[PDB]
Amino acid sequence: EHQAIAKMRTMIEGFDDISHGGLPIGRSTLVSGTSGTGKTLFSIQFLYNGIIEFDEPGVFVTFEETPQDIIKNARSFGWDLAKLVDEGKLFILDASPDPDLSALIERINYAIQKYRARRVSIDSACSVVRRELFRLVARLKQIGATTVMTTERIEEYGPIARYGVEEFVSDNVVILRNVLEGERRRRTLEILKLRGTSHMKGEYPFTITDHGINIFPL
Amino acid sequence: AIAKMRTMIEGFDDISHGGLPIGRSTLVSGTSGTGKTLFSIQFLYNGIIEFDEPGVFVTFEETPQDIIKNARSFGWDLAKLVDEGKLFILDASPDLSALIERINYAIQKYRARRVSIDSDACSVVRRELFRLVARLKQIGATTVMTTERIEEYGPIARYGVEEFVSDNVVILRNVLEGERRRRTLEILKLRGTSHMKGEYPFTITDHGINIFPL
Amino acid sequence: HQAIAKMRTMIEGFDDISHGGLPIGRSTLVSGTSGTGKTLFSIQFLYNGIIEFDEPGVFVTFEETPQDIIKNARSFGWDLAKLVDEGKLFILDASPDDLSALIERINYAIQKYRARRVSIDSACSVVRRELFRLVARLKQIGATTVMTTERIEEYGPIARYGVEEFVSDNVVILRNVLEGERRRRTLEILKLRGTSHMKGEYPFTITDHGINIFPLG
Amino acid sequence: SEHQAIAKMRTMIEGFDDISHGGLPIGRSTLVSGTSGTGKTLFSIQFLYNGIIEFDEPGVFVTFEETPQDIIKNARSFGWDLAKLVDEGKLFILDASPDPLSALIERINYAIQKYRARRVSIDSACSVVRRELFRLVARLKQIGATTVMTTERIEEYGPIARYGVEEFVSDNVVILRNVLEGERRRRTLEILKLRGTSHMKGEYPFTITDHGINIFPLG
Amino acid sequence: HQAIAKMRTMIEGFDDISHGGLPIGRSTLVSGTSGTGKTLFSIQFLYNGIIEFDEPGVFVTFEETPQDIIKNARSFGWDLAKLVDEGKLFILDASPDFDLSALIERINYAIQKYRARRVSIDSACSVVRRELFRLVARLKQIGATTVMTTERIEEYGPIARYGVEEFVSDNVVILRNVLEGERRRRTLEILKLRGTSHMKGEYPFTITDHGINIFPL
Amino acid sequence: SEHQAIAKMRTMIEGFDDISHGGLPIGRSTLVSGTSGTGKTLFSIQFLYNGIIEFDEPGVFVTFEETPQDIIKNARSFGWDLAKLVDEGKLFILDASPDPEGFDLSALIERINYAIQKYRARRVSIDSACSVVRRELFRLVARLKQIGATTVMTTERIEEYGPIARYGVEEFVSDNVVILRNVLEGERRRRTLEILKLRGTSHMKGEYPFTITDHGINIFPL
Numbered sequence A: 001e002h003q004a005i006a007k008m009r010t011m012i013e014g015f016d017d018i019s020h021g022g023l024p025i026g027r028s029t030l031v032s033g034t035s036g037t038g039k040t041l042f043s044i045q046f047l048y049n050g051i052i053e054f055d056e057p058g059v060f061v062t063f064e065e066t067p068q069d070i071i072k073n074a075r076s077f078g079w080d081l082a083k084l085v086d087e088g089k090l091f092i093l094d095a096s097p098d099p100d101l102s103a104l105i106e107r108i109n110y111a112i113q114k115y116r117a118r119r120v121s122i123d124s125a126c127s128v129v130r131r132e133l134f135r136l137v138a139r140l141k142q143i144g145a146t147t148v149m150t151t152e153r154i155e156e157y158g159p160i161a162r163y164g165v166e167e168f169v170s171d172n173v174v175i176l177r178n179v180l181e182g183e184r185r186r187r188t189l190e191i192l193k194l195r196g197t198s199h200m201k202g203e204y205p206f207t208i209t210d211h212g213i214n215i216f217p218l
Numbered sequence B: 001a002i003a004k005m006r007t008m009i010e011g012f013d014d015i016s017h018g019g020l021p022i023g024r025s026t027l028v029s030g031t032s033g034t035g036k037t038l039f040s041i042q043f044l045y046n047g048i049i050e051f052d053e054p055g056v057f058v059t060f061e062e063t064p065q066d067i068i069k070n071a072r073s074f075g076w077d078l079a080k081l082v083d084e085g086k087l088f089i090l091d092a093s094p095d096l097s098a099l100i101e102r103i104n105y106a107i108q109k110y111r112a113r114r115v116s117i118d119s120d121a122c123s124v125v126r127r128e129l130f131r132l133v134a135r136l137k138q139i140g141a142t143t144v145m146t147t148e149r150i151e152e153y154g155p156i157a158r159y160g161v162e163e164f165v166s167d168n169v170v171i172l173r174n175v176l177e178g179e180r181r182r183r184t185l186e187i188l189k190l191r192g193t194s195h196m197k198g199e200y201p202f203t204i205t206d207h208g209i210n211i212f213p214l
Numbered sequence C: 001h002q003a004i005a006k007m008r009t010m011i012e013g014f015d016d017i018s019h020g021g022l023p024i025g026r027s028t029l030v031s032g033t034s035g036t037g038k039t040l041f042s043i044q045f046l047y048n049g050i051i052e053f054d055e056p057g058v059f060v061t062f063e064e065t066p067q068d069i070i071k072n073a074r075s076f077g078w079d080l081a082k083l084v085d086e087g088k089l090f091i092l093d094a095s096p097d098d099l100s101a102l103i104e105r106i107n108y109a110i111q112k113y114r115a116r117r118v119s120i121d122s123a124c125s126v127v128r129r130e131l132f133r134l135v136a137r138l139k140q141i142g143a144t145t146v147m148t149t150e151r152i153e154e155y156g157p158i159a160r161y162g163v164e165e166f167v168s169d170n171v172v173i174l175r176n177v178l179e180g181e182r183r184r185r186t187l188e189i190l191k192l193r194g195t196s197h198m199k200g201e202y203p204f205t206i207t208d209h210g211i212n213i214f215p216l217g
Numbered sequence D: 001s002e003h004q005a006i007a008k009m010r011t012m013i014e015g016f017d018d019i020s021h022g023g024l025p026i027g028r029s030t031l032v033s034g035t036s037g038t039g040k041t042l043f044s045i046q047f048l049y050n051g052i053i054e055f056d057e058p059g060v061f062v063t064f065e066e067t068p069q070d071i072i073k074n075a076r077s078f079g080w081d082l083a084k085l086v087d088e089g090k091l092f093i094l095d096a097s098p099d100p101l102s103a104l105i106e107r108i109n110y111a112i113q114k115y116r117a118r119r120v121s122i123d124s125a126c127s128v129v130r131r132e133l134f135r136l137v138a139r140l141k142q143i144g145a146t147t148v149m150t151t152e153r154i155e156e157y158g159p160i161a162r163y164g165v166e167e168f169v170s171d172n173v174v175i176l177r178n179v180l181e182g183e184r185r186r187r188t189l190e191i192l193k194l195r196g197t198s199h200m201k202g203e204y205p206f207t208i209t210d211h212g213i214n215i216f217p218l219g
Numbered sequence E: 001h002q003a004i005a006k007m008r009t010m011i012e013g014f015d016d017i018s019h020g021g022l023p024i025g026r027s028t029l030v031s032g033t034s035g036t037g038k039t040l041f042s043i044q045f046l047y048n049g050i051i052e053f054d055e056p057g058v059f060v061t062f063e064e065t066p067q068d069i070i071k072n073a074r075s076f077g078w079d080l081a082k083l084v085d086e087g088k089l090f091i092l093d094a095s096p097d098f099d100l101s102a103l104i105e106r107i108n109y110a111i112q113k114y115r116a117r118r119v120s121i122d123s124a125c126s127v128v129r130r131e132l133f134r135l136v137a138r139l140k141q142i143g144a145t146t147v148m149t150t151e152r153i154e155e156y157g158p159i160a161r162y163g164v165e166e167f168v169s170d171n172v173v174i175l176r177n178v179l180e181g182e183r184r185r186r187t188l189e190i191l192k193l194r195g196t197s198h199m200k201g202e203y204p205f206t207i208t209d210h211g212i213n214i215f216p217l
Numbered sequence F: 001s002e003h004q005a006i007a008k009m010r011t012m013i014e015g016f017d018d019i020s021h022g023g024l025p026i027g028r029s030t031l032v033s034g035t036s037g038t039g040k041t042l043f044s045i046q047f048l049y050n051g052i053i054e055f056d057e058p059g060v061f062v063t064f065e066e067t068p069q070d071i072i073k074n075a076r077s078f079g080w081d082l083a084k085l086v087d088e089g090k091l092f093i094l095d096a097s098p099d100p101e102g103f104d105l106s107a108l109i110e111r112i113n114y115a116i117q118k119y120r121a122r123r124v125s126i127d128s129a130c131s132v133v134r135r136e137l138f139r140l141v142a143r144l145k146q147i148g149a150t151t152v153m154t155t156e157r158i159e160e161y162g163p164i165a166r167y168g169v170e171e172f173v174s175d176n177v178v179i180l181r182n183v184l185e186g187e188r189r190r191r192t193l194e195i196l197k198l199r200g201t202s203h204m205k206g207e208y209p210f211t212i213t214d215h216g217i218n219i220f221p222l
């Protein structure tokens, strides 16, 4: 009678151990952090590994970084996203305003079905934020997408995200930190919450190298 | 003394000196992922399973289907209890007066003794919260109400008034010590009765909340 | 033509800390975070007034029902129901559906029951003036009054709006401080205009006989 | 020839005239700021009372909250009979407290002329607070009164007063503190600034007793 | 293709900790409290580009006059008026006596005029974030490699002033001037470089007669 | 001449010319910021007084709250006879203080300019919405520079180790920044002076202790 909720493996080294199997399938995981913490990298590695390891197609939704820079930056880690877009295994949805929510979603829906995507990454007034963020989560759940949603925060040990509500609306919450002490920076990942399932607790150190994120349950 | 109802949440009835005061409202406040919803659910589930006391769960964001799914993680089959008419999940998710009349109706219909209510001006909140607590008191329900807070050692709840309108106040914390998280539960206040003081560690496992007093 | 006199609370240790009790004919502000003992102090004040001196009391509640006030005092062995049945205690229910209307009601009750002790439980610019009015009008009636107020930090503002301590003649702070994982309650008399008192924090506990304070003296 | 540029009048408050190197600058206003129950009213009353008793200098006490009756009653704590001084026309308590600014200044002026007062105690947005306070100070100076002005603050170490402008407009600033440390309170007085002369600096301990304020200047 | 390439600053110590210099074709935010060396860094970027690589530079100023930028550069033995006269450098005076699109076309007009490869820009949140993004995107489409300075008011607080600048920039450098025990210590940090690697944390530096010197310590 | 790095004018304030390696940058404004009673007015008077006495460089003092009479009176604390200097036409105190019973900075700047011309002054002291503050200070600084004045500008702050001035913009619009502190350490006060920045030239770093004496500011060696 003890039924566990299903998880999808990220294959990001060390993360699937911390999360006891990966990300809860069919739900959204908030990945929050200050600048340069690895939010986009995590969200890319999620889709890249799904395609390469499991032939699970992905939709990356971007709101500021252009598709070409995303693909360009992913070359830092030896990943050819251009090739995956050419094969129709990756779709980069450009939702970044040229130099509204209902429309964005059916766009994502259309892209999910067109590419048969199972994995989605979305990168990146409190009252309106909470309620508009809930319905975004709500709709993705109905599609059956497993989704990484990045958010920004401005303090390493302050609120989880910018408006103090995002962490309460999300099913799952991951926090990327880049803590400065004694003039040195230390990267850590923490799974704060996974509704309805177990996970390791606290911060785990990680590095970003030529092969992406490396977490040490170490 | 004052009559209490057993939560049967491991360790909690020892800390509260016998359980939660019957007919009164208990605030359960914590940061994200502290175990608020779990405490709420466990409170109703145990009431039903061990004492045949029916319950009403009121949810303002989480869907009933997710509540049920997330609870099967603990081997608790809530759909069964709903089917047997012993649990009712009130979906107020995605008008305070109408809500209260809806809660009231659900209590009468299912004959509930236990209620869990899960999750802007400073004293519209106080006024409206006081209203809700006041009416549940008249009905005679014993209520667990959860609230969010954003800091482990800061205000009790979001608006700085919630703990003053509640009869009882429980704080769930999830504190960083170095790079590790330690969960604790504290009964800050129980009106009209004694209780253990300060913080007590707990874990969440496959069997729910497990608190270690003494 | 002499320094203000005091009325004994008979709350163990408090009359030592205050050097004789609460200043007569004035209000004393009693401030604290949730569950610090504010209502208890303000009940014990009235209860001891009745039991020890046959001084009738009026309790003004704004949220807690009279029945709850009574039920909650049973854990101390205080039979408030009987005191209310005897006409010695009047619990004024001021829980809402203009404090000018409240004042006359209080005055009304104060005169029928011949009360000498009162407890009131419980825009910054407006707060200050409204509190000032209340203190002043209670002073005119001649009532010795405890009024509780809320605060949200143990070692921060005296009260909520940062003005209450400045309008009040007398100020008591109840604290409930974390020491390790344990809690420590303390009572402090911050100020009493026109008279002397002990300084700093004194530990207390809440027991089956109410507030129990320890000055080492 | 005491080699300091600003003439001072003695408060005769024990230890304060040492710390201030002679007392309060004559014809100027001194801000006295403190948290609740720090002694601000006591200091401003003791200033007037001593002026009267020691030098027969009449004094005006302006109160915005406490009633005259309570001011008088509370001074009895220190053995001071202010009603007697009011009856003798040596003390005037100006009641500006609210019923249970340009015109207030004229009342003050009228009282000062009527009672020949030498000492004044006034007891007790930022854009307009500054200019109104500046106005009040300047007018008392024009009259030639020597003024104690009390203000509130909410932290022992933090803003001098409430609006972050009071200490910049005043010529002199005194801070009363009531510091809680290790569950014990200790009172101190500091003269932060006195334009035009030296003064002792830092915090000095004091007590409030049956004789009023007692300050201990050390060195 | 392959990873983003870098442009050498020739600022001693910087090209080592950035592993090659500034990412080409992109903007780098250089944030710092007052007198941290922000203008000096953005000047040295252009100056070295001109002197070492004959890469012309455009310096955009919003407050300091060109005359003062030139005067202050004499502190380091650099003759900016000569470089301006030769057509190697252009100091674009956008200082008042804001339309961002007009400013952008002036920058574009200068870059085409002087064939510049390097640009230094010195110096609600919804508004700020949007405009900065447009400025950054435009410089990217032009091909400029850009240093943009910003102000911050705390050494270990927000990266810039509006809480958004560090999130729309591709690259972020933080200059600090930390006061500890009555002494100041200058440090430089590369916080992030999108799509490429760099050393982490604070590195001490000094400003002397020959500009910025960063020490790998 | 102007092919050279910026030149400095000596303050002759004890120790200050050492810390600043020559004095205040000529032709520019220096912000002098501090909490209450830190010695801002004293620094800005001593700057002018020394200019007149040591170099026969006339000074203009612009006061926005303290009356000229009080400024002169209080300066006697330091042995300085400012009335004598006013009388000889070497010092001019411009009273910009408000009547005891919006502000036009353009008009005031023009009144400052005439005084500078009339008294042929080389040294000026000015005592004492963020966007509006920034723009207005910018125009004042810019105009003084055009006039060629070397200027001390005082500002208030409310924390010893918090913001440099009140509005978080003053220290960015100013060419030079000096911070006067009055730090409470264990019930004692310690006065320190720091030159935070001087655009275009070098200076010593961090805090230097000073005292105010019957001869004014006295900054102790490092």
Ligand SMILES: Nc1ncnc2c1ncn2[C@@H]1O[C@H](COP(=O)(O)OP(=O)(O)OP(O)(O)=S)[C@@H](O)[C@H]1O
Binding pocket: A167, A168, A170, A171, A192, A193, A194, A195, A196, A197, A198, A199, B030, B031, B032, B033, B034, B035, B036, B037, B038, B039, B073, B074, B204, B205, B206
């Ligand atoms: N089977 C399990 N074993 C161990 N831990 C579990 C298990 N199931 C859930 N948890 C933990 O319980 C947490 C969820 O507790 P909740 O009661 O949903 O918290 P919450 O305080 O209500 O959070 P919100 O409403 O999302 S802010 C998860 O983050 C896990 O840490």
Ligand SMILES: Nc1ncnc2c1ncn2[C@@H]1O[C@H](COP(=O)(O)OP(=O)(O)OP(O)(O)=S)[C@@H](O)[C@H]1O
Binding pocket: B163, B164, B166, B167, B188, B189, B190, B191, B192, B193, B194, B195, C032, C033, C034, C035, C036, C037, C038, C039, C040, C041, C075, C076, C206, C207, C208
């Ligand atoms: N018999 C008892 N023995 C020990 N402690 C008791 C007993 N009865 C009550 N208490 C304690 O007293 C507290 C209630 O104190 P109150 O005076 O009601 O506090 P309060 O400061 O008025 O809080 P509010 O109004 O709810 S914010 C409870 O939280 C218990 O800790």
Ligand SMILES: Nc1ncnc2c1ncn2[C@@H]1O[C@H](COP(=O)(O)OP(=O)(O)OP(O)(O)=S)[C@@H](O)[C@H]1O
Binding pocket: C165, C166, C168, C169, C190, C191, C192, C193, C194, C195, C196, C197, D034, D035, D036, D037, D038, D039, D040, D041, D042, D043, D077, D078, D208, D209, D210, D211
């Ligand atoms: N005889 C006395 N012996 C010792 N202390 C006394 C005596 N009389 C009064 N006090 C003390 O003096 C304090 C009153 O000081 P005040 O001058 O009224 O303070 P205040 O700073 O004006 O405070 P406000 O106006 O109420 S915020 C009381 O709180 C007592 O601590």
Ligand SMILES: Nc1ncnc2c1ncn2[C@@H]1O[C@H](COP(=O)(O)OP(=O)(O)OP(O)(O)=S)[C@@H](O)[C@H]1O
Binding pocket: D167, D168, D169, D170, D171, D192, D193, D194, D195, D196, D197, D198, D199, F034, F035, F036, F037, F038, F039, F040, F041, F042, F043, F077, F078, F212, F213, F214, F215
């Ligand atoms: N002869 C002296 N010897 C020692 N200290 C003195 C002497 N004369 C004045 N002072 C000190 O100088 C201080 C005043 O310095 P100012 O220059 O007026 O300060 P300020 O920073 O301008 O303060 P404001 O404008 O009133 S906020 C006084 O508070 C005294 O501490």
Ligand SMILES: Nc1ncnc2c1ncn2[C@@H]1O[C@H](COP(=O)(O)OP(=O)(O)OP(O)(O)=S)[C@@H](O)[C@H]1O
Binding pocket: A033, A034, A035, A036, A037, A038, A039, A040, A041, A042, A076, A077, A208, A209, A210, E166, E167, E169, E170, E191, E192, E193, E194, E195, E196, E197, E198
């Ligand atoms: N090959 C590499 N080796 C080491 N670190 C690298 C490499 N490539 C990129 N990085 C690091 O990855 C960081 C960028 O990670 P991102 O995922 O872009 O961060 P981000 O959290 O999304 O930041 P934003 O969107 O700009 S706020 C850079 O700042 C580098 O520190």
Ligand SMILES: Nc1ncnc2c1ncn2[C@@H]1O[C@H](COP(=O)(O)OP(=O)(O)OP(O)(O)=S)[C@@H](O)[C@H]1O
Binding pocket: E032, E033, E034, E035, E036, E037, E038, E039, E040, E041, E075, E076, E207, E208, E209, F171, F172, F174, F175, F196, F197, F198, F199, F200, F201, F202, F203
């Ligand atoms: N020859 C030099 N030797 C040493 N330090 C110097 C020299 N010339 C200038 N400096 C220093 O350089 C600092 C100025 O650096 P800038 O680049 O102008 O700083 P900034 O961060 O742009 O400051 P702003 O724009 O005024 S907030 C001065 O405050 C001096 O400390």
Ligand SMILES: [Cl-]
Binding pocket: A187, A206, A207, A208, A209
């Ligand atoms: Cl790393």
Ligand SMILES: [Cl-]
Binding pocket: B183, B202, B203, B204, B205
């Ligand atoms: Cl756990």
Ligand SMILES: [Cl-]
Binding pocket: C185, C204, C205, C206, C207
């Ligand atoms: Cl206790």
Ligand SMILES: [Cl-]
Binding pocket: D187, D206, D207, D208, D209
């Ligand atoms: Cl004392």
Ligand SMILES: [Cl-]
Binding pocket: E186, E205, E206, E207, E208
């Ligand atoms: Cl340096």
Ligand SMILES: [Cl-]
Binding pocket: F191, F210, F211, F212, F213
């Ligand atoms: Cl000194």
Ligand SMILES: [Mg+2]
Binding pocket: A039, A040, A041, A123
């Ligand atoms: Mg990113």
Ligand SMILES: [Mg+2]
Binding pocket: B036, B037, B038, B118
């Ligand atoms: Mg929950």
Ligand SMILES: [Mg+2]
Binding pocket: C038, C039, C040, C121
């Ligand atoms: Mg209470």
Ligand SMILES: [Mg+2]
Binding pocket: D040, D041, D042, D123
């Ligand atoms: Mg007072």
